[model samples]
Target chain A: LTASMLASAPPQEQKQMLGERLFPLIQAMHPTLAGKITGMLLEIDNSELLHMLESPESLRSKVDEAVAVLQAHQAKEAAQKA
Target chain B: LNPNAKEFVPG
Candidate 1:
């Protein structure tokens, strides 16, 4: 799907459409963690997701951002529990 | 995007 289509879709539709586009790309990069990463990416705000849809090459950076976010969360959780 | 970004790794 094109970025224009994604941009025009309602919030629910945007997530679904972007998820469909992102899942496969993420899978290709991180097969074992695709589902998890895809879920995380979908959780991102639409502004970023829309930019990603418009620029597929930027997907890697977005995935990295998701991973970093997860890492920070887990780190904080560990600190809290310790 | 961060300028000095590195490749993503899943732990």
Candidate 2:
């Protein structure tokens, strides 16, 4: 029902709504980095992100993957600076 | 203070 509600909204609205819901879940896994992870999560394919929101089990893995990807990007950037 | 008056509590 919530996912259907999300799907009906406009793209900008969907992103805004999804970010609000995603932040708390992301915060649980990465309290310090939740906002950054939430931003990254919003960048994923719209349908996929919405589907993950519908399925709580998938949400965890997807969030973990986002965190991993963000960490990797940061590490690479640091390496370039050094 | 009137004896019949209830005490005023400060928030």
Candidate 3:
């Protein structure tokens, strides 16, 4: 869900959230896996961001990140909006 | 502390 939040966020904010927030969150557990996952994320299209976020583990939407992720999911609904 | 804590023997 955090990845969706990353996508919905403005370009400038996405940098901070993805590079700082999300990266550290992953590293908090497995530093070994964190680097590789972030590398893959760097190459993913924004449209595909939420697709991964909600795939197998799609967490409950009560956390602040889930709420924020709603925006990204909503934006993706348009898919072509400028 | 293994978050999600799993091990694999691929090697």
Candidate 4:
């Protein structure tokens, strides 16, 4: 599985893989938050995830829940945005 | 975030 593939990858590749994997997870969770994150992903022009990793609490549970709802098909309207 | 993005707007 890609999960296992991620484990053995080099630093740069692992970070890219993690973002790819988590992006959909966040999209599934909350589209608005996902939109914010997507903006951060595109506009920030750098490694947003790495920054988040450095300050893990920035991705709060409420934010994660919202994003997860979008991911889990609970937010149909939000999911359609993607 | 850019709400202007077509994907960001709601129906």
Candidate closer to the true structure by lDDT (higher is better), 3 or 4: 4
Model 1, span A10-49: residue lDDT tens: 8867777777777778888878767667777776787777
Show the colliding residue pairs in model 4.
Answer: A28-A70, A28-A71, A29-A66, A29-A67, A29-A68, A29-A69, A29-A70, A29-A71, A30-A67
Q: Where's the lowest-lDDT run of ten residues in candidate 1 chain A?
A: A65-74
Tell me the lDDT of model 2 at B3.
Answer: 18
Q: Alpha-carbon error at A59 in model 1, in Å?
A: 1.5
- Compose the digit string of candidate 2's lDDT tens values, residues A1-82: 2767877899877777777777777788888777777777777777777777678888888777776777777788889999
All candidates: TM-score:
0.60, 0.72, 0.34, 0.34
lDDT of 3 by residue, A18-46 (tens): 44434554444346555444433434454
Candidate 4 overall lDDT versus native: 0.46
| Pairs in clash, predicted candidate 3 | none
| Each candidate structure's count of clashing pairs | 0, 0, 0, 9
- The DockQ figures for the candidates are 0.05, 0.01, 0.03, 0.09
Highest DockQ against the true fold, candidate: 4
- Candidate 3, residues B1-11: lDDT per residue as tens digits? 11222221111
Q: Docking category for candidate 4?
A: incorrect
For residues A1-82, write the lDDT of model 4, one tens digit per residue. 2446656887655655555544664566554466544433333223454454344465454345444543455356567886
Model 1 regions more than 4 Å off: A71-82, B1-11
For TM-score, the strongest prediction is 2
Off by over 4 Å in 2: A1-4, B1-11
User: How would the docking of model 2 be graded?
Assistant: incorrect
Question: Chain B alone: TM-score in each candidate?
Answer: 0.40, 0.51, 0.22, 0.31
